[PDB]
Enzyme design. Structure first.
Site, PDB file in Angstrom:
ATOM      1  N   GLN A 141       0.325  -1.145  -0.270  1.00 37.41           N
ATOM      2  CA  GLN A 141      -0.323  -0.014   0.325  1.00 37.41           C
ATOM      3  C   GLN A 141       0.772   1.259  -0.300  1.00 37.41           C
ATOM      4  OE1 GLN A 141      -2.378   2.009   3.551  1.00 37.41           O
ATOM      5  NE2 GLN A 141      -3.200   0.349   2.912  1.00 37.41           N
ATOM      6  N   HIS A 143       1.054   5.239   0.042  1.00 36.64           N
ATOM      7  CA  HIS A 143       0.635   6.986   0.159  1.00 36.64           C
ATOM      8  C   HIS A 143       0.792   8.046  -1.086  1.00 36.64           C
ATOM      9  CE1 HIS A 143       1.693   7.313   4.618  1.00 36.64           C
ATOM     10  NE2 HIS A 143       1.221   5.933   4.291  1.00 36.64           N
ATOM     11  N   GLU A 170      -3.461   5.628  -0.428  1.00 39.04           N
ATOM     12  CA  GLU A 170      -4.087   6.116   0.179  1.00 39.04           C
ATOM     13  C   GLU A 170      -3.476   7.409   0.418  1.00 39.04           C
ATOM     14  OE1 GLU A 170      -2.274   5.732   4.305  1.00 39.04           O
ATOM     15  OE2 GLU A 170      -4.202   6.495   4.820  1.00 39.04           O
ATOM     16  N   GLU A 221      -9.409   3.075   5.823  1.00 37.00           N
ATOM     17  CA  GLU A 221      -8.352   2.571   7.081  1.00 37.00           C
ATOM     18  C   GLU A 221      -8.123   3.099   8.097  1.00 37.00           C
ATOM     19  OE1 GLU A 221      -4.204   2.703   5.742  1.00 37.00           O
ATOM     20  OE2 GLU A 221      -4.062   0.699   5.572  1.00 37.00           O
ATOM     21  N   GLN A 296      -4.968  -2.155  10.461  1.00 32.37           N
ATOM     22  CA  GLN A 296      -3.725  -1.346  10.639  1.00 32.37           C
ATOM     23  C   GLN A 296      -2.575  -0.847  11.713  1.00 32.37           C
ATOM     24  OE1 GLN A 296      -1.771   2.356   7.171  1.00 32.37           O
ATOM     25  NE2 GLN A 296      -3.156   2.867   9.235  1.00 32.37           N
ATOM     26  N   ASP A 335       5.224   2.797   7.180  1.00 31.30           N
ATOM     27  CA  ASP A 335       4.934   4.172   6.403  1.00 31.30           C
ATOM     28  C   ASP A 335       5.054   5.564   6.613  1.00 31.30           C
ATOM     29  OD1 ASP A 335       3.389   3.548   8.607  1.00 31.30           O
ATOM     30  OD2 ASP A 335       1.321   3.631   7.963  1.00 31.30           O
ATOM     31  N   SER A 362       1.521   0.336   4.995  1.00 30.43           N
ATOM     32  CA  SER A 362       0.976   0.517   4.616  1.00 30.43           C
ATOM     33  C   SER A 362       0.642   1.880   4.535  1.00 30.43           C
ATOM     34  CB  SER A 362      -0.344   0.371   6.385  1.00 30.43           C
ATOM     35  OG  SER A 362       0.806   0.852   7.075  1.00 30.43           O
TER      36      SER A 362
END
Ligand code: COY
Ligand code: COY
Ligand SMILES: [K+]
Ligand SMILES: [K+]
Ligand SMILES: [K+]
Ligand SMILES: [K+]
Lengths: 551, 137, 178, 551, 178, 137
Positions: A141, A143, A170, A221, A296, A335, A362
């Site tokens: 995942q 950003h 995200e 999330e 998460q 992350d 994440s």
């Protein structure tokens, strides 16, 4: 006179990081605190009367929520009686099946499973994680943010990130009123890079749900939970408001997970004398109890708190292992910045990268960290080549791949042009050809022309106030020369009607095929079994830039 | 009763999934979006779909996930703004006990959302005990 | 010693002031922010920014929570203009507004090490401009990826210490500023 | 038009690294090559007639040596007939004891054990390594060199490295005729930092043995073996000359190990079309066959060769695991530069650091890399704080500890003083008090006053010409008033007399206490068993500089 | 090209000639060194180094091994002075001498990418000084911790290719000039 | 014979390591070194000690390590310069077959190095086959 040796050491970036001696009475200790409660449960006529020391008379909302909904009371007494060392041995034993363990762990109390994983070293924990991970296939995942909330740039970065391999992306805001633009830009750019990538826009809880209700997101999330009652209260929720919210997302056909992470309670001033891992286990059981499929965690935004104390990065792996072991999808952090040192952040990442998790990170930053609006990720866009080289070095599937500059340029361009058509069609502030070109070739917002944020925010605002929904985006693409992309947007909207991607670890791959723990069952049984990097995917990973053919 | 052999629904039994308003998956085409033959109001998951998914979750060994799905199925009948009102009502210090019990009565009598009504009455009782009602901060 | 509590703050009656709401250890057990700027100096500049715009500054100390959003909410409840500025001892600041949920705001300053005395005054200025229903452009974004690495542990420690002075149910105190 | 994203990526250090596409026919492939031989063996009347496809009529010198001495023939058919996937599973299974596996792996042919370990991912290898490691306690080895061969600096650096925790230290020469000085410098300073620390001076084989006969070293390691006969030949040895050499060292009471490492045969031009891992396995079996207790491997100086190709860093961990599975001590490299990238070199090191090996590195540079005379190590002096921080982060004992500037300064000082006394007593070119304060405070040779190479080299060459021995060093110590050090020096030779430290993995700790695989038996059986970082050693590891006490 | 075998090389006579022993692909299959310095230029500076020291410079191509030590050894046997300089196509160089074991030497240059034409001439010079039994001070040590990271794999490929021209048992060939 | 239970010798049986010289570990003192009561040979390990350690190795399950130690015990009898001579003689292309056999006879007859003589004789026939003798290059 000073040692020149020590003078050179004093200058190293790692010595800029924040370190702290443990503060046990305030919970500033990552795990294995002498104040953590001895595992215990007592049940009378089907109702818990004692949990990990505490009598029911003293339960807080978190104890109540966990004792009533978080533990399989039918086997809790049996499992409490088992030896925690044997159970920890079971976790990392390749010949004890995941399916044999999950019935036991989901009957453990929070203190019990913490006691179990605390007997383990990180090698044992990684050995365990590859097996307990719910989805057979590991994922990733990212950003997608920038410090200007530039929507053209977000679409382009999102397309590139999807192309590179992220299955979830995200965004969030520098300026909160921009949110609907960011969300739409993220969704469009993500479907251009790879139809099927899921998108979220992380905001205040009510605001994010409403955005989702309007159709501009695929999942949520950052649905936060906390491990002490006072901290949960300052988080402006209770286990019950957060469980209702969870069900509210599902009632709109939206995938969602909770977020937690060690050190939040320390950061927010009330650890009730407990270690970070023990309080994070409460968060993990709150998640289970709520009926939320995934979580998460791995300190996430509070990573400077466990990282400051001994065994904090081991604790972070442990909380991830508890999450997977309790049969929840784990989006395993990696992350957020915690260090100035490349060596140190690499060690923290490999704990999850080597075994593989549902989402190894994440929130890998698919933008240079200057543009990262969660205040920096543990990896950013400038690390992409390193990440691919380590995949190749170790034969580990990190979820990503080498890519060609010309493909990335074509895909970024298409994303910007599709978004341009979206803004025109919806009557939003124009996206100019010059902005399309800059987004095409940009590294970050420094390469982008400045926008009129007054006009953007006014129209972003009106998307909300006039309830302009996701089908408006589909029509403008269809009407604007982007029928393929329009179809892809419609398809990801349709995913909200089946409930299929609401299941544990679901992502959407290939031609709109749901891939979850239900149909992609992790079947690890030691060497040469379970998910293995091989075949075409291995060839793909082998093919890094700079690898000259020897002959 | 749906089992993991029935999953994914979209592949195994798309028919089972027919929306808010009798549209099928295949009714959602670009053409139908564009002619407005289908609109946002049609594009809503049903309580039936969510209860099927709840059965699959249980078959997958995930009872609390199933219960979440059962609550969601009930909430599909509650309008978006009412969903947000009730979520906000449950946040600390927003509500009095009587206001929560009335949301609960309304869930049950207006929407037949008996599980969610039960859920909200449970919060009211514990919000008294743990002091998270209006005026307790 | 520069802050004197002068009684339970009452609700403002006219849209002519901004409330500055400070955490329960501000100017007391803690006297500088996370990077050493004196509380005295911070209060001076925010007050000047507000007054600069022809609006009244009114200062209160909050007790019911040490969280800066809830601190600011205590202040917006009492502000004649509905506008408030929440400030923790460590420096974290928020501009809040009567009507918004606690964890929503008009502008937020979530990396206290990055704030300068020039920032604090701009914050006061903007707060005043909201009060008067203009639509000020927001104070420009300060962000730095190494802020958490350098300071998040220290920020947790300062917050733990301020939080000890929380008093459930105690209404804010109006403050005289030396 | 260029993508600025790709322009940023192109600048990253990792893209300065050497990468190559596999070249199967020239053996430029790390492992799992279609040309490697199918495992096989034939035995008749106790002798091998077939080995991994090849008939004895075709055996080269390596085949003969391994067939006649390198394999447990009593269970070789038994183990050959076991499934390699099951055997790999046994390797990482926490509940199959090391003592149950060693009889089987030592009975495997080189191709068989390569086949076994190739079924494994790096998490499984690490899980296995922590069990197969012969010494229960992990240790560490450092390089102590400088580009000047400056002896007072070597003594200072040696002392600091010993104090930081290295149990073995290695020097070598910028200019070969300087060697006796380096050796004495290293010994003296090492004993000053911690009596018991073992030292070596790495040279051409006949030269090194003689320095050892003269008493200026305590062990030898760079006793090279190679995995193809033409390469071995260019290395100027055969398995029999190296086997003879091995026993020659033992006949003088000197501990020794061989050195090998993937990629040497490629690097030297004759891979015989085989994978680096398969040829390395032959090197490991040559070591076993020779009766040599241990091995330095993990590519070592050839690390640019496997690191250039896919799965090269996994192959390096695999060759370390084969080493330990064969019941040999493993000094597991992490001692040679292969990358410009901190992320990348950290991933390569953790493979051994996380599970722990007999020597996690076989030459961490205890000087800045500019001074490293093996053309750079994977870690150097400027990494010490990072290394300690990661130990603390993961609760991993990497063999080293945080230290106080004041202590290091003292310790470097007494060592410079001691070597100064020694040169006096020995009538060697003088070490001024100037020189002593500089080595006290030096980071490196850039901080040292230039010396007369000519006078030093003259007296260095004479120590060997005139067979000047260790006693001369000892007396000079005593004479100048360093009785303690002179005793400590005496005590090393004493160890030489007993033979105890000739055994597998031996180091010498505390009050001259040998610690080897014989009396420090690795008993891993899963979580909470085997070596565990705890008690005072953990307290020591927690105590990094900059940890602020929160209250 | 630039190199011409002029028969099997014959034993030396005068102790004031230095042989340059060249790998079996030097100037043939390979013409430049690992970093692009051409073989002719390298031979040029090496010779120029020796000659200007007033010593004869003789060049032979070595066959029985591509290993730089052994091809230098092949040369020291025939050098009237007993001093020889071994050079691989990739550029690695060694100054040898009769009486030394093959993996010993007078001076080694074990990181070819750091060599320069100026370095090559110094080597010839020093070889000549040794051939006159002069005991020159050694060519200053070249070292770079990133040389292997950048060039070791390439070094390998080049060595592999040169190695295909090794002829076991075949005696060194004498070679003529530019 | 020595066992793992006997190890370390220094700790459990230090008097088993009395030199051939008949003087213990304790005699190796700075003072004694100074007064020349103990000298360079004095610290020469003995074949006796190496045979002790060989037995422990065996006991420890390490037969090849034991074998090395047995060769080593034999080699204690061979002078340093002679050790180097034989090592170099075993390097590629240094010797004729007859020269190696001479070395082995020597080992056997002058030093009673039986095992090492067999090892060298072994080298001699295989160097013939694999062409590693003088002139094979
Ligand atoms: C660390 C952090 C937190 C954490 C600490 C909060 C705290 N109060 O102690 C954490 C994870 C618990 C957290 C929660 C939330 C909650 C608010 C809870 C609360 N009472 O404050 C939140 C509402 C999310 C939610 N789902 O509810 C929230 C949001 C929206 C935001 C944004 C605010 C936007 C705005 N209002 O303008 C934000 C700018 C990110 C973004 N781009 O949207 C950010 C400030 C976002 C920040 C990104 C950014 N651009 O700055 C970020 C990542 C870095 C801040 C920092 O380290 N500064 C350095 C430090 C030295 O300076 P400081 O001044 O001391 O910093 C303080 C302030 O930032 C303050 N603060 C932090 N968030 C926040 C929000 C509000 C409204 C206010 C008034 C003050 C807030 O806390 C710190 C410590 O005292 C940050 N957070 Co929070 C990011 C949420 C991420 C997803 C959830 N999540 C992640 N990890 C975990 C976990 N382990 N457990 C549980 N949930 C999570 N946050 N955050 N956060
Ligand atoms: C890589 C390397 C090797 C490897 C490749 C050699 C080859 N022939 O291909 C390796 C490990 C097999 C090796 C062997 C030896 C053997 C000789 C074998 C031989 N025929 O070359 C050796 C005699 C040791 C022994 N115990 O026998 C030897 C020594 C002593 C040395 C030193 C020479 C001193 C001197 N004579 O003045 C040396 C300066 C190190 C030191 N400081 O002591 C160094 C050159 C030492 C070097 C340190 C340094 N200061 O440079 C170092 C560490 C880096 C050189 C480099 O990468 N340059 C970059 C490259 C792009 O440039 P290049 O010009 O192409 O480099 C070439 C030369 O260095 C040459 N070369 C390398 N060593 C060497 C020695 C001599 C006498 C000659 C003529 C040419 C030699 O090989 C490379 C590649 O072709 C290096 N080596 Co060697 C290092 C030995 C270290 C311990 C054993 N060891 C370590 N790893 C492994 C392994 N995986 N398997 C088995 N053994 C080992 N080496 N080496 N080596
Ligand atoms: K937590
Ligand atoms: K995330
Ligand atoms: K090898
Ligand atoms: K070494």
């Amino acid at each position: 006179m000073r040692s020149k040796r020590f003078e050179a050491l004093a200058k190293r970036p790692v010595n800029q990081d924040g370190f702290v001696k443990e503060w046990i009475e305030e919970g500033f200790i990552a795990m294995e605190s002498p104040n953590d409660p001895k595992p215990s449960i007592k049940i009378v006529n089907g109702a818990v009367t004692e949990l990990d020391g505490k009598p029911v008379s003293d339960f807080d909302l978190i104890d109540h929520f966990i004792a009533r909904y978080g533990i399989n009371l039918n086997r809790a007494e049996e499992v409490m009686a088992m030896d925690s060392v044997k159970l920890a041995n079971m976790l990392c034993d390749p010949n004890v099946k995941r399916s044999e363990i999950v019935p036991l762990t989901t009957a453990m109390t929070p203190a019990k499973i913490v006691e179990v994983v605390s007997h383990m070293n990180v090698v044992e924990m990684m050995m365990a994680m590859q097996k307990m991970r719910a989805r057979r296939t590991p994922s990733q995942q990212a950003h997608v943010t920038n410090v200007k909330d530039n929507p053209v740039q977000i679409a382009a970065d999102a397309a590139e990130g999807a192309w590179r391999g992220f299955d979830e992306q995200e965004t969030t805001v520098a300026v909160a009123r921009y949110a609907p633009f960011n969300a739409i830009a993220l969704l469009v750019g993500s479907q251009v890079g790879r139809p099927g990538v899921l998108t979220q826009c992380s905001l205040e809880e009510a605001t994010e749900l409403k955005l989702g209700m309007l159709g501009h997101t695929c999942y949520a999330e950052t649905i936060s939970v906390y491990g002490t009652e006072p901290v949960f209260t300052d988080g402006d929720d209770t286990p019950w408001s957060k469980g209702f919210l969870a069900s509210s997302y599902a009632s709109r056909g939206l995938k969602m997970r909770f977020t937690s992470g060690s050190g939040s309670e320390v950061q927010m001033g009330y650890a009730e004398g407990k270690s970070m891992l023990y309080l994070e286990a409460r968060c993990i059981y709150i998640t289970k109890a709520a009926g939320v499929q995934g979580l998460q965690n791995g300190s996430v935004s509070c990573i400077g708190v466990p990282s400051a104390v001994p065994s904090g990065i081991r604790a972070v792996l442990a909380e991830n292992l508890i999450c997977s072991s309790l049969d929840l999808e784990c989006a395993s952090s990696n992350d957020q910045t915690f260090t100035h040192s490349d060596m140190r952040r690499t060690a923290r990442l490999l704990m999850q990268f080597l075994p593989g998790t549902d989402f190894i990170s994440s929130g890998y930053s698919a933008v240079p960290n200057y543009d990262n609006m969660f205040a920096g990720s543990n990896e950013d866009a400038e690390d992409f080549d390193d990440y691919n080289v380590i995949q190749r070095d170790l034969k580990v599937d990190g979820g990503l791949r080498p890519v060609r500059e010309e493909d990335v340029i074509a895909i970024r361009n298409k994303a910007a042009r599709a978004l341009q058509a979206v803004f025109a069609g919806m009557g939003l502030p124009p996206i100019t050809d010059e902005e399309v070109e800059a987004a095409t070739y940009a590294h970050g917002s420094k390469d982008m022309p400045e926008r009129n944020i007054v006009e953007d925010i006014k129209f972003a605002q009106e998307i909300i106030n006039k309830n302009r929904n996701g089908l408006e985006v589909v029509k403008a693409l269809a009407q604007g020369g982007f029928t393929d992309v329009a179809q892809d947007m419609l398809n990801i909207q349709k995913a909200k009607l089946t409930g299929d991607y609401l299941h544990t670890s679901a992502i959407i791959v290939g031609d709109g095929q749901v891939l979850s723990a239900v149909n992609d069952v992790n079947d690890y049984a030691g060497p040469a079994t379970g998910y293995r990097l091989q075949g075409e995917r291995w060839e793909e990973i082998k093919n890094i830039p700079g690898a000259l053919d020897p002959n | 009763s749906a089992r993991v052999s029935d999953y994914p629904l979209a592949n195994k039994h798309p028919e089972w999934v027919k929306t808010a308003t009798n549209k099928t998956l295949d009714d959602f085409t670009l053409e139908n979006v564009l002619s407005n033959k289908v609109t946002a109001q049609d594009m809503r998951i049903t309580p039936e779909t969510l209860r099927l998914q709840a059965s699959i979750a249980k078959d997958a060994g995930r009872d609390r996930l199933a219960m979440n799905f059962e609550r969601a199925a009930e909430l599909t009948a509650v309008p978006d703004d009412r969903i947000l009102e009730i979520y906000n009502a449950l946040r600390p210090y927003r509500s009095t006990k009587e206001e929560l019990l009335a949301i609960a009565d309304d869930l049950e009598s207006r929407y037949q959302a008996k599980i969610c009504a039960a859920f909200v009455r449970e919060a009211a009782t514990l919000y008294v005990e743990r002091k998270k009602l209006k005026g307790d901060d | 010693g520069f802050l004197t509590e002068v009684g339970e703050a009452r609700q403002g009656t006219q849209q002519d002031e901004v409330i500055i709401a400070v955490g329960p250890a501000f100017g007391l057990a803690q006297t500088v922010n996370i990077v050493g700027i004196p509380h005295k100096s911070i209060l001076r500049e925010v007050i000047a920014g507000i007054e600069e715009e022809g609006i009244k500054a009114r200062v209160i100390r909050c007790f019911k929570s040490s969280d800066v959003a809830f601190v600011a909410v205590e202040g917006n409840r009492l502000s004649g203009s509905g506008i408030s500025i929440g400030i923790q001892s460590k420096g974290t600041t928020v501009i809040h507004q009567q009507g918004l949920p606690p964890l929503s705001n008009l502008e937020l300053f979530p990396q206290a090490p990055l704030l300068t005395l020039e920032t604090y005054r701009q914050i006061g200025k903007n707060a005043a401009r909201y009060a008067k229903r203009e639509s000020p452009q927001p104070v420009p974004t300060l962000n730095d990826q190494m802020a958490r690495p350098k300071y998040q542990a220290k920020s947790a420690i300062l917050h733990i210490k301020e939080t000890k002075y929380v008093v459930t149910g105690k209404n804010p105190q109006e403050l005289r500023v030396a």
